[PDB]
């Protein structure tokens, strides 16, 4: 007896719609959690924390949901307003992979939202089947000849807009943009939610520089702007990243 079960709590949609947790999915001691404090092995001591008895009272019981040589990463935006509240996020999509259907993902996605409306699952996947088919041969390029472009990048996350400027060579594939996204968040001290969002807003920036190379075939490799220290010897960098609170 006196033992908590290992499952049957999925108080996540209430925290999706809690309006204090900074979640951009939906719109309509002194620690908060004892993940550094012991409780002397009495489970009543975890009820003193306000975000935990919130999950015990407002919680629910769930049933568990039960279910290629080079990946083509395509960032897929999903913007659907649905009964006042919206659905706003971004995710990459392995276009080379087809192990999960977008309808299977949308039935997975609307279950954690606790919507399961069965027409969001069509409308999410129809947008995904749109944006995969619109970008099916624009992220599979073979860019050579050292384009070495400068990149201004912006990232929108709850009025905490990140901005940087750097010279990117989309000829060597040594630096993963997800790895480049991680090195900013490690050094700036940001949260883990900027690990996908910087990489998802860079792959879209990459396939836009891929776009102008394959659609209009504009090379325009003419002096990526520098500060006369590295590549182009003017007199012998561009900027540094920042998270601007607008």
């Amino acid at each position: 007896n006196q033992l908590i079960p290992q499952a049957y709590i999925s108080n996540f949609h209430n925290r999706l719609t809690n309006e204090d947790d900074g979640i951009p999915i939906f719109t309509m001691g002194n620690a908060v959690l004892p993940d550094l404090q012991d409780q002397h092995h009495n489970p009543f001591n975890i009820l003193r924390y306000p975000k935990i008895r919130d999950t015990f009272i407002n919680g629910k019981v769930v049933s568990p949901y039960r279910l290629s040589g080079e990946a083509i990463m395509i960032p897929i935006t999903l913007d659907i307003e649905h009964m006042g509240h919206t659905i706003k996020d971004q995710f990459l999509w392995n276009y080379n992979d087809d192990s999960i259907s977008p309808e299977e993902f949308a039935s997975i996605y609307c279950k954690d939202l606790d919507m399961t409306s069965a027409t969001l699952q069509t409308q999410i996947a129809n947008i995904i089947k749109e944006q995969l088919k619109d970008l099916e041969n624009i992220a599979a390029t073979e860019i050579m000849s050292d384009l070495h472009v400068i990149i201004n990048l912006t990232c929108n996350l709850q009025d905490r807009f990140f901005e940087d400027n750097f010279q990117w060579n989309l000829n060597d594939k040594s630096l993963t943009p997800e790895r480049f996204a991680t090195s900013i968040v490690q050094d700036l001290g940001l949260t883990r939610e900027f690990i996908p969002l910087i990489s998802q807003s860079l792959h879209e920036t990459i396939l836009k520089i891929k776009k102008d190379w394959v659609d209009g075939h504009l090379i325009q490799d003419h002096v990526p702007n520098d500060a006369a220290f590295g590549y182009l010897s003017g007199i012998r960098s561009n900027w540094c990243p920042r998270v601007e609170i607008l």
């Binding site: 996540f12 925290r15 947790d21 900074g22 979640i23 002194n30 620690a31 908060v32 959690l33 993940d35 550094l36 975000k51 935990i52 999950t55 050094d187 700036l188 001290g189 949260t191 883990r192 939610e193 220290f229 540094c240």
Partner: protein, 118 residues
């Protein structure tokens, strides 16, 4: 002149400033964070003991005893040599190093990195 010093001192000041930005908010202000999707206190990985070595088996002192002693223990080798990994360098690279004791010095630090287990 006064270009190369002014840029690098601004780099060291920015490295000092970015350290003062990341050390206050994470560890000193509230000693962690809180994720919005799951009720999990976020923390830097630098204070987390990311790996774990083997177990150590013993016995309690009295025979015919029923007491279980589960515990934990930290471990390191000499706590002063850092972990600048030369073991993530193939053995063919540092063979045109101009000396021979450096080949010993690379491999000893490699063997220092290879005795992570106790």
């Amino acid at each position: 002149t006064n270009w190369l010093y002014q840029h690098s001192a601004a780099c060291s000041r920015f490295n000092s400033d970015l350290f003062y930005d990341r050390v206050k908010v994470l560890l000193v202000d509230q000693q962690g964070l809180r994720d919005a999707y799951t009720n999990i206190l976020h923390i830097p990985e630098s204070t987390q003991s990311t790996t774990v070595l083997g177990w150590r088996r013993s016995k309690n002192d009295s025979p015919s005893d029923t007491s279980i002693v589960y515990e934990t223990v930290i471990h390191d080798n000499d706590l002063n040599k850092p972990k600048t990994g030369l073991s993530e360098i193939p053995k063919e690279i540092y063979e045109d190093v101009v000396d021979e004791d450096v080949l010993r010095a690379i491999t000893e630090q490699q063997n220092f990195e290879k005795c992570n287990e106790y």
